[PDB]
Paper text:
Phototransduction in retinal rods occurs when the G protein–coupled photoreceptor rhodopsin triggers the activation of phosphodiesterase 6 (PDE6) by GTP-bound alpha subunits of the G protein transducin (GαT). PDE6 consists of two highly similar but not identical subunits (PDE6α and PDE6β, Mr ∼100 kDa), each containing a catalytic site and two domains (GAFa and GAFb) that mediate a negative allosteric regulation by cGMP, together with two smaller (identical) subunits (PDE6γ, Mr ∼10 kDa) that are the binding sites for GTP-bound GαT (GαT·GTP). PDE6 is a 3′,5′-cyclic nucleotide phosphodiesterase and a member of a superfamily of enzymes that play critical roles in compartmentalizing cyclic nucleotide signaling and regulating many physiological processes. PDE6 is the most catalytically active PDE and is the only family member that has coevolved an autoinhibitory PDE6γ subunit, which enables G-protein–stimulated activation and completely prevents basal activity in the absence of GαT.
Strong cryo-EM density for residues Pro55 to Met57 allowed for the identification of a new hydrogen bonding network between the glycine-rich region of PDE6γ (residues 55–62) and the dimerization interface of the adjacent PDE6 catalytic subunit. PDE6γ residues Phe50, Asp52, Pro55, and Thr62 form hydrogen bonds with PDEβ residues Glu249, Arg255, His258, and Asp252, respectively, through interactions both between side chains and with the polypeptide backbone. Our high-resolution structure of PDE6 holoenzyme revealed a detailed interaction network between the glycine-rich region of PDE6γ and the PDE6α/β dimerization interface.
Numbering used by the authors:
A (entry chain B): 7 to 827
B (entry chain D): 11 to 38, 51 to 61, 77 to 86
C (entry chain C): 12 to 38, 51 to 61, 77 to 86
D (entry chain A): 7 to 822
Write the structure that this text describes.
Amino acid sequence: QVHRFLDQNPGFADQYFGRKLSPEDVANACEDGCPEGCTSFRELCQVEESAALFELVQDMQENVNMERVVFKILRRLCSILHADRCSLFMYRQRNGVAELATRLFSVQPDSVLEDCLVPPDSEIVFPLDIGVVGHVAQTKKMVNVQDVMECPHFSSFADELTDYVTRNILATPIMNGKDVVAVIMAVNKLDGPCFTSEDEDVFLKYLNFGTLNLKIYHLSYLHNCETRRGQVLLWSANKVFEELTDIERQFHKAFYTVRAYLNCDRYSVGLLDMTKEKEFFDVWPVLMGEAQAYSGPRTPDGREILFYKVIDYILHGKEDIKVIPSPPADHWALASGLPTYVAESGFICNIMNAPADEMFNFQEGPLDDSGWIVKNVLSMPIVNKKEEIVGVATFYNRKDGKPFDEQDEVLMESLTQFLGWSVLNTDTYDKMNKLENRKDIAQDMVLYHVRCDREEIQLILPTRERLGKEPADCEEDELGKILKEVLPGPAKFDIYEFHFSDLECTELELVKCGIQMYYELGVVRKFQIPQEVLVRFLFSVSKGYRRITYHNWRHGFNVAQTMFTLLMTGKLKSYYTDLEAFAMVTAGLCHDIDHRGTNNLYQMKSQNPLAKLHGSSILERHHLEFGKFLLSEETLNIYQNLNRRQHEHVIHLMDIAIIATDLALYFKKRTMFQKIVDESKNYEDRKSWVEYLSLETTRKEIVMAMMMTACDLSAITKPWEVQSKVALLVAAEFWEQGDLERTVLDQQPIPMMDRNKAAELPKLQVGFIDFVCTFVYKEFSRFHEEILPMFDRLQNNRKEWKALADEYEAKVKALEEDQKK
Amino acid sequence: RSATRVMGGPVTPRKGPPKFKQRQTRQFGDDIPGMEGLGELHELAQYGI
Amino acid sequence: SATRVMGGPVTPRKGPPKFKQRQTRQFGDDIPGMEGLGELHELAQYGI
Amino acid sequence: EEVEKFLDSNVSFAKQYYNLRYRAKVISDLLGPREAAVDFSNYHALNSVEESEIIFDLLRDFQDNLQAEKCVFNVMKKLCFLLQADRMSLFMYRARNGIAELATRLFNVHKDAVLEECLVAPDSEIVFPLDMGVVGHVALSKKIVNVPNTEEDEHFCDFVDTLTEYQTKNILASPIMNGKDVVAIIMVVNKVDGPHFTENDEEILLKYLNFANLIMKVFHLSYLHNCETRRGQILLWSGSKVFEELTDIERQFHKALYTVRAFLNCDRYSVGLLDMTKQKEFFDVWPVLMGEAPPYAGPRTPDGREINFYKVIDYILHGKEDIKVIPNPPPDHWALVSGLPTYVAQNGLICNIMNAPSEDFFAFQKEPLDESGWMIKNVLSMPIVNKKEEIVGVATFYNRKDGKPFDEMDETLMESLTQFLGWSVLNPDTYELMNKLENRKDIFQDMVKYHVKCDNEEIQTILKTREVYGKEPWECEEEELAEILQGELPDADKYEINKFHFSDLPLTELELVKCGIQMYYELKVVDKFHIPQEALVRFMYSLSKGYRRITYHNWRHGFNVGQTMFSLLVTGKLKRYFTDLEALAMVTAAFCHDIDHRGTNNLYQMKSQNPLAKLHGSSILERHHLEFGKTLLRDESLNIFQNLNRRQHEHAIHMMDIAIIATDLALYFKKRTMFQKIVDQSKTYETQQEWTQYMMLDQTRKEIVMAMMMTACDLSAITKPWEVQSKVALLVAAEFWEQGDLERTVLQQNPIPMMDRNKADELPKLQVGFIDFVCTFVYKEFSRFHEEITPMLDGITNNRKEWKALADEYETKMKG
Ligand SMILES: Nc1nc2c(ncn2[C@@H]2O[C@@H]3COP(=O)(O)O[C@H]3[C@H]2O)c(=O)[nH]1
Ligand SMILES: Nc1nc2c(ncn2[C@@H]2O[C@@H]3COP(=O)(O)O[C@H]3[C@H]2O)c(=O)[nH]1
Ligand SMILES: [Mg+2]
Ligand SMILES: [Mg+2]
Ligand SMILES: [Zn+2]
């Protein structure tokens, strides 16, 4: 009624308000003596505002609800600032571009939350540079446009869309750690021509509470998103590292396990072919014109895009995960065409309001019977470490109804990136499978080339002639009779004697002698060894040995023949059961199976695959592995009529036997054998020592190892007429290995291996006898007196070699003095 | 009725071709320090042992 | 200092330490859909 | 002036006008920096004006640069004034190893105090367990507690009272909550004027904790968000290095633990790797069992193996980054001397140590480990789990960068890191499995290569260098080898090597090897490409040995196919379209077309799930033959392509790959209309010269022609004269019957009548059907293509006629 007069007299108004108001008040006013706070109503206004902000703080403290608190703050700020209305603009980052979407619109001092809240489907998404609000967000500062007609940033999109006229605009960005949470905005100054600087100061200071509330909301959202990202990464890592599988299984496990942390109604994963090049019979139709070339879209790697399998994860309502092999182009995921574009470009596609999109033919409306409409889409390319797109993952309809923002983009990008790197696991798995299949094929080829064939077994088991049947058909008694009438007797060849020589017997005769040795031990009957299997296994062992100078089939029968003599003529079978003797003679046969003619040292120096697979005792472990694999074959498994415990003991005892043939291993454990031999002299008679030793396990293992290392060098303990010839073959093999060293490795061989130093062979043999064999054979002669001939023959051979070496030395000295001196 | 007088779509004042993000290739190997370290006899030598 | 402690953190009860149990509870074909993830008559008559 | 009466008459208008014109100024002043004007030197009841001033002062601290400690301390000063209080304090809620702890962060806060005299460093905090104290009772009850007398309380502890020389009579405490987790506890110690704290003070505390609740909520949320972000970054960065390549455990662990060195926020951490040898070899267990050496004494893992850190990687980060590796670290090592890694390996328990020098269980260093005075204060050591629950290593993280002891969030972060590392052992183990499997495959491939290679004693059966010159073949000159071969190799005219009616029945396998060598000599590809003649002979003998000794697909079939290819090139005059290199490669492919055939067709390989079927997908046996032949050609002693150029070698290998793969009937059936189109195109041209000139330039048509020639040669047995076909067909039927018997026995499936041994009398009918179906098209099209291949068509026609006669006789016999 007088408002204009109060305006024209600011001094009178200030004087009147500064008057001390009487204790009488108007309405409640929380009058704890508050009428005169330096002004008539400054005390009352202070009290009322303090109460209001305290209520706002109470609302903030429990059950954080940023919408309601921000709405109340805006409602009060509308009255304080005299603005016609206020609004709130949520900040989101889609596709790397900041966007400002409405969350509270047309807020008035007499409005309610329901009439001002903006649902996700009614958002006016202003980009970063298409409005004054965008300019505020970009500049990260307050903007006070006194008159907005001349503002170069103003956009009339919102006011035209909402049937409104905007004159003055005041806005500020809600700030949190250099991240714009939101942008409050007040428009249409109701009283004055524009918003004064005092109104600007009030806008800054009164918005600190809203700043705190939005900071809390943003921090909660960020913490939840980061927790979900950590959980999905950990769960994907757990399933990826569970085992080695293909792309499909690994991706399905990773994607299904983390379905709870994605908060998506639906998402589908499409898998692309990896065939870089088509084979010749597929290129022929295009070149010859019988078929047209593929002119469709291609990956950045110049690859055909063909989703060969799409895994569909439908999570809204009922969980009905589907797998679509060779999906049609009509598939609801592929029909939109977004996965194809993602494959073509390898981009990160974030689609808001999919039905309103123009580039992609998203479906018009309801997809399934439930009327689920695609609204927000985020598509991701799964790229391996080699920058190749393995597949495309697409997510639909975020469960909370909001579009996919930056946080969801990074959350799903971390998952897709982790799974893309996990393709190395699948590549390694498929290379494992390829290598295993190739090794199995090579093993089968070896088995064919080593196993005695159908025709070769008739040389030792003639049954198509004697009986007219194949060996697999004849009964055990028939084959036993055939072997008895075919196999040599124990006296035909002195297989029971330490002086056995193989220089006057054929290889077939050697195999027959091996079968006879098996029969002598009596292990064929008690263990029910299939006789045809025994003959086949021995022939296969004979074939498995190479055709090299020394380490051929003959050396490997002489190793096993010597062990047979040790067991039955040296009477060392007292400490060993029949099963142990059986498994111990078999290991004697597989002593040096597949020896390549080069020693263990050459394997390491030449960097053979053997040296990489084993490392220590290379060739011995290789022989053990080959023998065990050959025995694993059913047609050659003599250990097939054996108990599981018996078979395990046999195999175990074979491992010590074969490996102990290594000379380096023997040199490190011979003192233990010396101690064991010394224990024998402590006992009174042989019977007591037999009783004690036959029950010990480790001591029997040591004795068996030393028996191996004595049988290996048994060629020296042969009569001189045999040792002289055998040493020549040994020297020839070592000379061949030295020549191989000089040629391939370009290294000077040691004198024992040097073909040039052929005249030094007697001296080298004398040194070898004095160093290695002497200990073994002396200790064995001390242990068992029956092995004494194997020591006397060694001493005789040493004497002969010493005589030859002395003759060579005398010749060298005579040449040195008689002319050179 | 919504305070923004629009239903059924987040209408945008921007008319143009959509733009899409670039895949992050920030790497999100031996240059690591310490990488290098991670991976009577004469007669025996004479006789190839 | 406010708490009159200069050296280090001080607890009233001092006994043997208690230590955490390693976390194991939280972490195949049980997942659905993994089952599916992994002139002509005479042609078969002649081996092909 | 008369207006002054009007506002007095109705003061509602005055209130509204003050709101319209001065409310904004009042709010701006109140929310300005300013200061509270409440008299803090007295104890008057709080006026609504003073209450509003206090509220605004508390709201003044709600700035963007939220210093949680300072704002909460200001709230405590105001609460000390309001509550008639003497002192107040705060206890941060920290979660150590399962047992939650409450450590003092603000202490002895009074109305005239400052942050400097109330802030508590991590080295001055008083850690309190959940069980003892009114603080612990408040934390467990999660509710406000008022104690009117400490003497009658059952939880009150005098520890702080004795340690601070203070007496507490009345206690009022309340917890600060974020959701349902306790964040901090605000407690009061003494009522200045009164028996205790009344209900009014309890209401004041609840009213004024809202600001403190919000500030603590902001601080807690920020810390948790930072921790979770760091955990995510650690996981992703470590996965990047884990999936960078396939390496051993040491390299992968070093990469993962060095790439995330910034995210761990630790001054120092060390990782010790345990030995994985569960069982020691027999020669190592012998001395222990024999008394030579004493057995292992002490620290043992729960898995049962000995604790032996064979390699320790220590990452020093407080000053100069000093990443170091200690192979076989001694017990004197600063990381292992404390014994915490050994204890963790013994137990497998996550250990968080606060104030390590004060601990007595472990001998932590109490002297400066570094020259800068670095101290071990807080330690966190954890195992590396592994998928088999086998402790493979121990990761120990020393003093935190911020100085605070490790809490539950740090435990969770490092536990996620160590769990990922333990899960990421499948790749290190698979790396060793890869290496061993590849080495084993190489070993067995060398074994098969030896077993099929012609040895030096078998090459003398043909290359008789020893008995002619006395030298080994590798020593004799090329001219000498040529002379020996000319003396030894047969005559093409005498053996009908370049005829379509060649029969291998009266020839030995060695004779066929010599004939095959003569085939290469006739094409004049030896001198042109300088093929080592010794290598040629050795490779031919290796091909002879490589073919299995099965019924039909023995080496005689391969030599027959090679002879057919040679005759097609020479007698059929198909060499016009092909170069010398292409002819050489084609002949080599023909000889290697069925190398190492098992005797069972592709369907049997697929049905039995043979490793061949799992390796090769489409053409199993043909791809296997191609691979084996190329491996045989890769040997230096067998490589006849060694003297070829790189382009020539690649073209030959490609051409062989096309030829051998096309030998299968399935590929021929699909790609046989192309041959008809090519023949029609040939007949379009006027003179043979123009067609030949067109063909030598086009490559796809040449490839298709050779692909058809491969199948024409593979079925050439039918085109042979009747006296040969009658036996070859029986051999083929015998092999297919063997495969059918194998199917019936192993696969337990009924064989097709073609492979059914019982239906042996139906062989003529099946052969007639075979001729009508597969071979007739090929040979008719080839005869139309070249009139010189007409004898092949005549032979197949005659064989079909005689097979039809036999089938008709059989059918007539079945009538009755
Ligand atoms: N109807 C209405 N429009 C608003 C409101 N706040 C801002 N706008 C309008 O939304 C628009 C966003 O871009 P501008 O800032 O350039 O201009 C703004 C104003 O025109 C409001 O509270 N109510
Ligand atoms: N001198 C002093 N003692 C305190 C303070 N706050 C807590 N205390 C004491 O620390 C103690 C912890 O256990 P109680 O809760 O039973 O009792 C408590 C109080 O006696 C403080 O601010 N000053
Ligand atoms: Mg050996
Ligand atoms: Mg074939
Ligand atoms: Zn063939």
